[PDB]
């Protein structure tokens, strides 16, 4: 079903924490434009009829893959939300 | 069958109830024709149990 | 502990909907509110006009009975609307209770729009990780996403030209 | 079936005891045991002065045990919101947001899941 | 911004009735069949409740007035209760 | 296709006509069919005599004697066909002749009043209420008599009881409390019975002489000698026992109330109470119930027998005096005509009330015609019973067999007093008396299991809801062909021998034979049976007897198959089973699907819609032929033209076979060659795998008929014109709506196509094609204001009806099942190119998953598999009585015959065995299935006699390891009811009071979400998905449309608010004296209405 | 079974809602019985029979 689900499980303290993390990352990709990715360039989700999956046919796979990478850091309470969103909005013109 | 568990969850009086030992002693039955008189007898007293 | 300043429901809460041609369908609360107002009004009048003590106690009884009926119909007699139906108006108690009442209604919310139901057939080819779906249902279901994409494509000029494009099987 | 389930079932069904020694309140009162040892700690541990809340644990019909409930929301569920709320109002009632039902009517997230 | 963690049931003072009440309705005038606007300050007066038009009528559905009985009234429940709380 | 019938049982009598029950009930209900002077008085005349005689004798001026003489109604005002075209009800106007007398000289006699326009029973039995016809249903109850049961608490002593109906009326209860109490309760209050006996004319001395003659408790009535010396005074003391605040001086005031008409039951004098009286307790029944008022004194030939009974059963054994509650013999049945007549009597009683008031208000005697007569009350009452009574409903128009079964089946429930829903466990079990009386396999499974069943096929009601069944008289060692329809109670009196017993004619063929002494297996000599089972057929209802090999199948699914037999949809192609029971001819005979030639004659003309026949009598009559007629469910209705012009047809000769008859034979569904084998996954549990050919051939299809309708109204905002106008945008789709408002006929329809044009306030408001599927336009009806005989409802400016047809072929999702019970749904049709095929190119039609049969208990199905496989090469049919029919010996005989045929022609082809055959035969030897060393020819022949043979794959073409049994199985397509259609709506309408989505006619509609579903969601951590469901997909119009638009632009959906139903309930709480405050983590109010509640 | 009964279907919509549905409501994710620890994906009659037949001697 999902690659490295055991690995992500090990890196994730609770299954529901992994769920929340994945969903937060996916909605991040969505809201600020899909460019909110860290492993996109070289390896990337890719479609079948074309390479359309490089963009966002299904974000959740993107979040899972980035989680398989150590690129993202998810804190249950890691940063003040106001400044995190503010810096996301300054540094992402992908909108 | 099922009504067993039904009342098992609702604290009730089982119809076919079995007299339990009110005391922690020995048992001494009187085999009286009409109804037995089984007593939980211990070094202080015997508890009546009139068995139909 | 007793009632002397009875708040008056917000307007739409007991809706008056125009059925057609001029008839009005009103939530029965108003049918009782009106009577209450009349009650209190004549009470004021007689207290200004004169003190027929038997009479005064009469209007007091009608006032209190109207109050109670507004709180609950049927507890003392069965007040109903004007001639035409012997159906006691749904009181506050009636609205808040009953086998299909406010408690029954609020907690459940039995209706989902993006829902469907029909017969099934085995998917021996299908893996449990997937499901066997006749397209023609997902069609109506994802009309939103379908228009989204086919505007994402050149399929229709606009989302609504898309609506028109997709409203016909032909 | 693993016996865990029945463990929960019984531990929940028989979670009330009835006082026999009044402390702050009357002895003749049968309600949440955990409430009761918490009160005992309060009165003798937290409170000095050993006012004992003597009780006997209550064997209660599970139907009754549910009916013997705290929140007025669920209590007002079936029988009569009229009378239930009668008590809920006679005394300043403070129903904590505990239990899935009342949490649901409010539409608030059940504590479980996420 | 607070999340509700408790609910509280309590009785109401007629002063409290006013504490929320947006005026009082005093003559039960829903609407004239010609003029389908809330006829008076009656059971649907826009001002007592809120703007009928877009804050839209939600405030009407939430803002509530009161009605003052010259003769006080008794909550039917508190007596009709099988234990009549007042009578006890 | 010669018919090989195997069962050899001499049916002394044939099957009687099925549905008379509903005819006679109505037919017997109305004696008006014959001269009113005809003795038949049930129904009409009984109600007249009961309620017609309205007397005001002494009230001011009295002498009002309005007496009935003659009634009659003989006219259906409009034809049944018109009664459908217009929604008119087939009735007859009944005139009741009445003459008025008064204490004064002069007899005003207003003869005829059309009092009652009572619907007339259709030939089938249904009645035309409004355009369409309904059908009444009968029921069961306690036979009104005298019955005895030991005291529920007091086991040593029992009690007796008398049950008068209707319910209003005292319920006689008798018990003896030996402490000095003789307790009889009429409705509630006890009364020492002996006082009443003395009131009646009975003296204590004689009461003891002839009562205490044998018994001991007689002294319990001599004790009250204080009231035993005042006989007529005892009556006033009785009324003193009554404490209504009324004067005891009333000679027979309440005595009449306890006489014959009102409280005492009017059950037929002689058996309805007398049989219960004559037989159980008491001898003669002078008057149906206890009544004597001619001389002030009373006669009651029951209570003295009832007390003699109590004495006997309490003290001695004058008989086996104990009445069973659940035994069928004391449990009676109710007819439709009885309902006609009792609602009739209610109407007459109400009319008597009004005429009574009016006569006294009527100053002069010139008041008989109108001032005494007004038909409004009872007329509307009859309308209420035939329309507002829930008993009668739609008629089962699935298939003629379905209809007949529905029309000859009785239930227990009804008005409720007979028996309501919550207590049937004891009744649900099949009483012993059901034998030859009730088929216990025909009952509807489910909540109403044991509630409804078709009677024994041969069993019939003798007089009064009492089944008697044929039984072969058996005298000594000689059986008599004479058949006696025995009463259930009388049945216990003898020893009924089974029909399976061999005989040499009228004499048995076995000394030791089982018989039914009293519902037990009694293995006795032939001389110990008084009657022998006429046939297994009598044991069951009609629907039971249509599955051939019941002898090897379980009842659990026998009931399933018998039931599914009703849901069969007549097909385009009607086939008869390869193996039959033998009644299909009688089936299509009693069931009027096909046409039958009255007598000998010849064909004058046979046109697609008519047939003029010319009989040998020198006459000729033509009969129009039903080409396409819609059912209650929208199917075809045709009598297949079966006779050529100038074709000599004899009496009773089938003329045009009904919609589901092959050749005067039951023919629905089809016979298909089938092989049982576990295929990959398309025969999973009960899934059926079909080859393509049955679609290439026109082999499973039917026409479904859809009947839409709309109307224009005259709204006070403006009448809703039925027009062609769609104001706003497009005219292109309006071409289809050819005429203005109405559409052109004979066209295909796509979903969403305009059906009827119209505009509200102008605002476009018109009919369109319902989502789903519409076929081709066939018919229209246009009843505008020009109502010729139609009454368009108020506001309805006009009405219009539309008929579409869709030739529904069998498709992927369809469902099929066999007669022998096994059911299933088509799983897939496979391209016949690769599907398994015989050594002969001929492949099978269907492959089943065998795993079903073992769990099921039904071997008759596989037996039929063998039989049909044989008949395949034999090209001929068979008749198998359920148990007396074919035997496996003849099975193997036909197996050898058919194998010889098949492989002798194989040999003539120049080909014997193939290497594939030899290898498979070797492997069968390996499994021992074929004797090693036997010829591949001979061992293949034995395999054939095994009913299994070799097979080739088709995809890999390989032969199939393991021989497989196959055959021509007569499989039916069940009712593919509406649940089959997709109910899949995404967006559309919502409710008025609430915002829960609800579409329907416009859009499919939101699916029921239920509660336990939310419980499952709760099991998962489905927090925001459930939030979405209940807010974005349940109630929130604003949120749901916001998500709509977010999806439209494809962005992240918005945040649901606090549940607004929650806030509404908060406002409700505040509305009453209750005040509700939300609390913070610490005790502090937290506001839900951010600024919408705080004043200012 | 396949006796005629028809099933229903709905859909989670929100990205988080869909994520949660796929995560802990996937059948491929929901293998063992949580009621009791038995697996609820027990192989069916046809496959069981096939493997027993293949592995028999
Ligand atoms: Mg099923």
Curated annotation (Swiss-Prot), chain A:
GO terms for molecular function: DNA binding; DNA-directed RNA polymerase activity. InterPro entries: DNA-dir_RNA_pol_omega, Pol_omega/Rpo6/RPB6, RPB6/omega-like_sf. SUPFAM superfamilies: RPB6/omega subunit-like. Its EC number is 2.7.7.6. One of its GO terms (cellular component) is DNA-directed RNA polymerase complex. GO terms for biological process: DNA-templated transcription. Pfam families: RNA_pol_Rpb6. SMART domains: RNA_pol_Rpb6 (SM01409). It catalyses: RNA(n) + a ribonucleoside 5'-triphosphate = RNA(n+1) + diphosphate. Gene3D superfamilies: 3.90.940.10. The keyword Ribosomal protein does not apply. Keywords: DNA-directed RNA polymerase, Nucleotidyltransferase, Transcription, Transferase. Belongs to the RNA polymerase subunit omega family. The RNAP catalytic core consists of 2 alpha, 1 beta, 1 beta' and 1 omega subunit. When a sigma factor is associated with the core the holoenzyme is formed, which can initiate transcription. Promotes RNA polymerase assembly. Latches the N- and C-terminal regions of the beta' subunit thereby facilitating its interaction with the beta and alpha subunits. This is DNA-directed RNA polymerase subunit omega. It comes from Thermus thermophilus (strain ATCC 27634 / DSM 579 / HB8). The lineage of its organism: Bacteria, Thermotogati, Deinococcota, Deinococci, Thermales.
UniProtKB/Swiss-Prot annotation, chain B:
Signal peptide: none annotated. Belongs to the RNA polymerase beta' chain family. DNA-dependent RNA polymerase catalyzes the transcription of DNA into RNA using the four ribonucleoside triphosphates as substrates. It comes from Thermus thermophilus (strain ATCC 27634 / DSM 579 / HB8). The RNAP catalytic core consists of 2 alpha, 1 beta, 1 beta' and 1 omega subunit. When a sigma factor is associated with the core the holoenzyme is formed, which can initiate transcription. It comes from the Bacteria. This is DNA-directed RNA polymerase subunit beta'. The chain holds residues 1255 to 1306 of 1524 of the full protein.
Swiss-Prot record, chain F:
It holds the Pfam family RNA_pol_Rpb2_7. Keywords: DNA-directed RNA polymerase, Nucleotidyltransferase, Transcription, Transferase. PROSITE patterns: RNA_POL_BETA. The keyword Transferase applies. Belongs to the RNA polymerase beta chain family. NCBIfam families: PRK00405.1, rpoB. This is DNA-directed RNA polymerase subunit beta. It comes from Thermus thermophilus (strain ATCC 27634 / DSM 579 / HB8). The gene is rpoB.
């Amino acid at each position: 079903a999902e690659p490295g689900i055991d690995k992500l499980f090990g890196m994730v303290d609770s299954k529901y924490r992994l769920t929340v993390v994945v969903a937060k990352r996916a909605q991040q990709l969505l809201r600020h434009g899909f460019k909110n990715t860290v492993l996109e360039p070289e390896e990337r989700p890719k479609m079948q009829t074309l390479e359309g999956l490089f963009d966002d046919p299904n974000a959740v796979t993107w979040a899972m893959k980035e989680l398989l990478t150590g690129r993202l850091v998810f804190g249950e309470n890691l940063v003040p939300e106001d400044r995190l969103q503010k810096e996301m909005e300054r540094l992402y013109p992908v909108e | 069958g099922l009504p067993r568990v039904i009342e098992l969850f609702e604290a009730r009086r089982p119809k076919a109830k079995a007299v339990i030992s009110e005391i922690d002693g020995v048992v001494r039955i009187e085999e009286t024709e009409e109804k037995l008189s089984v007593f939980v007898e211990s070094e202080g007293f015997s508890k009546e149990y009139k068995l139909p | 502990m007793i009632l002397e300043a009875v708040p008056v429901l917000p307007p739409d809460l007991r809706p008056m909907v125009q059925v057609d041609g001029g008839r009005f369908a009103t939530s029965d609360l108003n049918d009782l509110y009106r009577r209450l107002i009349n009650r209190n009004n004549r009470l004021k009048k007689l207290l200004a006009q004169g003190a027929p003590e038997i009479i005064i106690r009469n209007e007091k009884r009608m006032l209190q009975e109207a109050v109670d009926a507004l709180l609950d119909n049927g507890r003392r007699g069965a007040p109903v609307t004007n001639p035409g139906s012997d159906r006691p108006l749904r009181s506050l108690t009636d609205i808040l209770s009953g086998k299909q009442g406010r408690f029954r209604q609020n907690l459940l919310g039995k209706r989902v729009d993006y829902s469907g139901r029909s017969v099934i057939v085995v998917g021996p080819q299908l893996k449990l990780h997937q499901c066997g779906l006749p397209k023609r249902m997902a069609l109506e279901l994802f009309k939103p996403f379908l228009l989204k994409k086919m505007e994402e494509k050149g399929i229709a000029p606009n989302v609504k030209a898309a609506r028109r494009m997709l409203e016909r099987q032909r | 079936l693993h016996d865990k389930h029945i463990e929960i079932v019984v531990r929940q069904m028989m979670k009330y005891v009835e006082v026999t020694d009044p402390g702050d309140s009357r002895l003749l009162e049968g309600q949440v045991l955990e409430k009761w040892d918490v009160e005992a700690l309060n009165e003798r541990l937290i409170a000095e002065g050993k006012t004992p809340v003597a009780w006997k644990p209550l064997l209660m019909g599970v139907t009754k045990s549910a009916l013997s409930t705290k929140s007025w929301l669920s209590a007002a569920s079936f029988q009569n919101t009229t009378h239930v709320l009668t008590e809920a109002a006679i005394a300043g009632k403070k129903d904590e947001l505990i239990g899935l039902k009342e949490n649901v009517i409010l539409g608030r997230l059940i504590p479980a899941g996420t | 911004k607070k999340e509700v963690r408790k609910v509280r049931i309590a009785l109401a003072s007629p002063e409290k009735i006013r504490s929320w009440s947006y005026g009082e309705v005093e003559k039960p005038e829903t609407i004239n069949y010609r003029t389908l606007k809330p006829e008076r300050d009656g059971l649907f007066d826009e001002r007592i409740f809120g703007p009928i038009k877009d804050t839209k009528s939600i405030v009407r559905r939430y803002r509530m007035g009161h009605i003052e009985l010259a003769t006080p009234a008794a909550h039917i429940w508190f007596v009709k209760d099988v234990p009549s709380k007042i009578g006890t | 296709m010669e018919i090989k019938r195997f069962g050899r049982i001499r049916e002394v009598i044939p099957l009687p006509p099925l549905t008379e029950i509903q005819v006679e009930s109505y037919r017997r209900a109305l004696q008006a069919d014959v001269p009113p002077e005809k003795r038949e008085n049930v129904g009409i005349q009984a109600a007249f005599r009961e309620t017609f005689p309205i007397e005001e004798e002494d009230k001011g001026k009295g002498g009002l004697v309005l007496d009935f003489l003659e009634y009659r109604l003989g006219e259906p005002p409009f034809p049944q066909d018109e009664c459908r075209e217009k929604d008119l009800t087939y009735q007859a106007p009944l005139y009741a002749r009445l003459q008025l007398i008064h204490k004064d000289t002069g007899l005003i006699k207003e003869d005829e009043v059309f009092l009652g326009h009572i619907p007339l029973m259709t030939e089938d039995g249904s009645f035309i209420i409004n355009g369409a016809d309904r059908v009444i249903v009968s029921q069961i109850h306690r036979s009104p008599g005298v019955y005895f049961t030991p005291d529920p608490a007091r086991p040593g002593r029992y009690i007796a009881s008398i049950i008068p109906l209707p319910k209003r009326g005292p319920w006689i209860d008798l018990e003896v409390e030996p402490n000095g109490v003789v307790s009889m309760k009429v409705n509630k209050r006890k009364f020492p019975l002996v006082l009443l006996l003395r009131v009646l004319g009975y003296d204590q001395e004689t009461l003891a002489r002839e009562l205490g003659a044998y018994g001991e408790l007689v002294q319990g009535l001599m004790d009250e000698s204080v009231f035993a010396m005042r006989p007529e005074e005892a009556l006033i003391r009785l009324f003193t026992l009554l404490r209504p605040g009324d004067p005891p001086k009333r000679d027979k005031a309440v005595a009449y109330v306890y006489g014959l008409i009102a409280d005492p039951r009017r059950y037929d004098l002689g058996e309805a109470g007398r049989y219960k009286a004559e037989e159980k307790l008491g001898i003669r029944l002078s008057g149906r119930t206890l009544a004597r008022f001619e001389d002030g004194e009373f006669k009651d030939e029951v209570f003295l027998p009832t007390l003699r009974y109590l004495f006997a059963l309490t003290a001695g054994v004058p008989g086996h005096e104990v009445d069973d509650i659940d035994h069928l013999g004391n449990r009676r049945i109710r007819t439709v005509g009885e309902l006609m007549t009792d609602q009739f009597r209610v109407g007459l009683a109400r009319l008597a009330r009004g005429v009574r008031e009016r006569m006294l208000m009527g100053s002069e005697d010139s008041l008989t015609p109108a001032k005494l007569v007004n038909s409004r009350p009872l007329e509307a009452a009859i309308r209420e019973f035939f329309s507002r009574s829930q008993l009668s409903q739609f008629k089962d128009e699935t298939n003629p067999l379905s209809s007949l079964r529905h029309k000859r089946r009785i239930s227990a429930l009804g008005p409720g007093g007979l028996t309501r829903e919550r207590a049937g466990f004891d009744v649900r079990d099949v009483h012993r008396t059901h034998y030859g009386r009730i088929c216990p396999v025909e009952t509807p499974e489910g909540a109403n299991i044991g509630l409804i069943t078709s009677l024994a096929a041969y069993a019939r009601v003798d007089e009064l809801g009492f089944i008697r069944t044929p039984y072969r008289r058996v005298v000594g060692g000689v059986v008599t062909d004479e058949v006696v329809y025995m009463t259930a109670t009388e049945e216990d009196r003898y020893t009924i021998a089974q029909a399976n017993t061999p005989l040499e004619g009228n004499r048995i063929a076995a000394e030791r034979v089982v018989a039914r002494r009293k519902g037990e297996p009694v293995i006795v000599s032939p001389e110990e049976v008084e009657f022998m089972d006429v046939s297994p057929k009598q044991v069951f209802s009609v629907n039971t007897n249509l599955i051939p090999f019941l002898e090897h199948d379980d009842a659990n699914r026998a009931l399933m198959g018998s039931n599914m037999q009703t849901q069969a949809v007549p097909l385009i192609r009607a086939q008869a089973p390869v193996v039959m029971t033998g009644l299909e001819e009688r089936v299509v005979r009693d069931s009027l699907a096909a046409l039958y030639a009255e007598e000998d004659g010849e064909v004058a003309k046979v046109d697609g819609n008519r047939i003029v026949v010319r009989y040998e009598d020198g006459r000729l009559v033509e009969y129009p032929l039903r080409r396409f007629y819609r059912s209650n469910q929208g199917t075809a209705l045709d009598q297949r033209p079966r006779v050529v012009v100038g074709q000599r047809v004899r009496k009773g000769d089938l003329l045009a076979d009904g919609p589901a008859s092959e050749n005067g034979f039951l023919a629905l569904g089809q016979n298909v060659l089938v092989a049982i084998m576990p295929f990959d996954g398309y025969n999973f549990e009960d899934a059926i795998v079909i080859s393509e050919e049955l679609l290439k051939r026109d082999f499973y299809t039917s026409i479904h008929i859809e009947r839409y309708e709309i109307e224009a109204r005259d709204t006070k905002l403006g009448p809703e014109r039925i027009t062609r106008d769609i104001p706003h945008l497009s005219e292109a789709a309006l071409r289809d709506l050819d005429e203005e408002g109405v559409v052109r006929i004979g066209a295909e329809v796509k979903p969403g196509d305009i059906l009827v044009g119209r505009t509200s306030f102008v605002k476009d408001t018109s009919l369109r094609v319902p989502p789903g599927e519409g076929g081709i336009v066939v018919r229209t009806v246009r009843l505008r204001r020009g109502d010729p005989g139609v009454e368009l409802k108020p506001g309805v400016r006009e009405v219009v009806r539309v008929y579409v047809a869709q030739k529904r072929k069998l498709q992927v999702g369809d469902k099929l099942a066999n007669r022998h019970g096994n059911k299933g749904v088509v799983a897939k049709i496979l391209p016949v190119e690769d599907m398994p095929h015989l050594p002969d190119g001929t492949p099978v039609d269907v492959i089943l998953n065998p795993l079903g049969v073992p769990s099921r208990m039904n071997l008759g199905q596989i037996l039929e598999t063998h039989l049909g496989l044989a008949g395949y090469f034999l090209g001929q049919r068979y008749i198998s009585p359920i148990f007396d029919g074919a035997k496996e010996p003849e099975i193997k005989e036909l197996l050898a015959q058919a194998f010889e045929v098949y492989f002798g022609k194989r040999k003539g082809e120049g080909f014997g065995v193939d290497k594939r055959e030899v290898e498979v035969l070797r492997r069968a030897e390996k499994l021992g299935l074929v004797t090693p060393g036997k010829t591949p020819e001979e061992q293949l022949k034995e395999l054939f006699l095994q009913g299994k043979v070799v097979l080739y794959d088709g995809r890999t073409g390989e032969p199939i390891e393991g021989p497989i049994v196959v055959g021509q199985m007569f499989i039916m397509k069940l009712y593919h009811m509406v649940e089959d259609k997709m109910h899949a709506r995404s967006t559309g309408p919502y409710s008025l009071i609430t915002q829960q989505p609800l579409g329907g006619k416009a859009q499919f509609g939101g699916q029921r979400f239920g509660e336990m579903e939310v419980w499952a969601l709760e099991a998962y951590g489905a927090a925001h998905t459930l939030q979405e469901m209940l807010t974005l997909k349940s109630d929130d119009i604003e949120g749901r449309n916001a998500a709509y638009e977010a999806i439209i632009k494809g962005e992240d959906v918005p945040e649901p608010s606090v549940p607004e139903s929650f806030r509404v309930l908060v406002k409700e709480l505040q509305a009453l004296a209750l005040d509700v405050q939300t609390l913070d983590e610490k005790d502090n109010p937290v506001d839900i209405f951010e600024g919408l509640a705080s004043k200012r | 079974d396949f006796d005629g009964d028809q099933m229903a279907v709905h859909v989670p919509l929100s990205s988080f809602a869909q994520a949660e549905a796929r995560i802990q409501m996937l059948s491929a994710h929901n293998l063992l019985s949580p009621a009791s620890g038995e697996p609820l994906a027990k192989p069916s009659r046809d496959i069981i029979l096939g493997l027993y037949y293949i592995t028999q001697v």
